């Protein structure tokens, strides 16, 4: 009950006590997030949109 | 130490700076062409007359001198990596652009909001 009450106090806030954060592993907590890992430069995203991998078949 | 040793002319030329009288007149003219601030940047963004402002930036100013577009160049005399600015008096002399070695890189930054 006490730990649940504290979670309501820190709901939404960007900083939480370390005991209420996800454990996982040390290496997993230091890895780049999904947003950080997917970042591309403006130069590269223009190339990706212009020339993506096409789908084709050898029929005729 | 830098005074005890002999100073080559390329560096020694920076010991002469514009005197207090015409330097004040110089900054008086330059203060009339302050770049637009972020506050009045919002007003313009939210159709406009052609602006007149002081040009700054070492790469930006050097390109202007090489294209014979700068009419007057102010040079700070206290750049610690002196190589950055040491070639400007010769470059201006070669290109025929008048220049003045002025005292204070902080004072130059004041009129460009830096």
């Amino acid at each position: 009950q006490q730990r649940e009450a504290v979670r309501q106090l820190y709901k939404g806030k960007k900083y939480q006590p370390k005991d209420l954060r996800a454990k996982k592993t040390r290496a997993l907590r230091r890895a780049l997030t999904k947003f950080e890992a997917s970042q591309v430069t403006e130069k590269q995203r223009k190339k990706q949109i212009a020339f993506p991998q096409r789908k084709y078949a050898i029929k005729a | 130490l830098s005074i005890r040793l002999k100073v080559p002319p390329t560096i020694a030329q920076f010991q002469y700076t514009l005197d207090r009288n015409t330097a004040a007149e110089t900054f008086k003219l330059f203060n009339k062409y302050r770049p637009e601030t972020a506050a009045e940047k919002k007003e313009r963004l939210t159709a406009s007359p052609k602006p007149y402002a002081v040009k700054y930036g070492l790469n930006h100013v050097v390109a202007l001198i090489e294209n014979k577009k700068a009419k007057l160049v102010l040079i700070a005399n206290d750049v610690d990596p002196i190589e950055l600015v040491v070639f400007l008096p010769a470059l201006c002399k070669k290109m025929g652009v008048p220049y003045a070695i002025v005292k204070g890189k902080a004072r130059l930054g004041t009129l460009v909001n830096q």
Binding site: - | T10, I11, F87
Partner: protein
């Protein structure tokens, strides 16, 4: 801009102007600690072409390294072996003094990653270097596509494994017939050439 003029002027190291600048700066560096933080690059043009950027997360450090050979650390010069291994004085370290500079800076700031380094000065006793460092924890780096590759755990302590520019030269990582011993890694190549390969149906 002005970077082109800096590059050409830096090549005239025995001109009157640069001889004066190196004498004053070498004295100033000698008065500081062997390793100390630098507020800004001494050679901004050189830093840019090695990958440095003027933004939060990039750090410059200056380090001083002793010159000369590597005396063999044996008691009273006794080696206890055959005469071919009896030399003490004329021995040379297989890594450059630049590599030693990066490694010591890397241990000092273990939260950072070594990117590159460059020569600045030297006297009879010391060689001087400036090392470029990137903070892998700073959000300006992790959110930047051109530099967040350094945040990968595979790039931890690049200087210790000889993965920097000076490390790869000392490892002999180059193409051609002149680098047959070290093209893919000296020890890896030696293992391949000294391995007996036996198949199920013997050839």
């Amino acid at each position: 801009g002005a970077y082109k003029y800096l590059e050409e002027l830096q090549r005239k190291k025995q001109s009157d102007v640069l001889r004066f600048l190196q004498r004053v700066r070498v004295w100033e560096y000698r008065q500081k600690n062997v390793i100390h933080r630098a507020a800004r690059p001494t050679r901004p043009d050189k830093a840019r072409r090695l990958g440095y950027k003027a933004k939060q997360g990039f750090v410059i450090y200056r380090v001083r390294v002793r010159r000369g050979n590597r005396k063999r650390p044996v008691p009273k010069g006794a080696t206890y072996g055959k005469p071919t291994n009896q030399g003490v004085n004329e021995l040379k370290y297989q890594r450059s003094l630049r590599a030693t500079a990066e490694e010591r800076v890397g241990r000092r700031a273990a939260n950072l990653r070594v990117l590159n380094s460059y020569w600045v000065n030297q006297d009879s006793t010391y060689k001087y270097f400036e090392v470029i460092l990137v903070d892998p924890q700073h959000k300006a780096i992790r959110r930047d596509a051109r530099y967040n590759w350094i945040c990968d755990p595979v790039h931890k302590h690049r200087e210790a494994r000889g993965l920097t520019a000076t490390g790869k030269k000392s490892r002999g990582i180059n193409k051609g017939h002149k680098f047959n011993n070290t093209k893919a890694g000296r020890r890896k190549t030696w293992k391949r050439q000294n391995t007996l390969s036996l198949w199920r149906y013997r050839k």
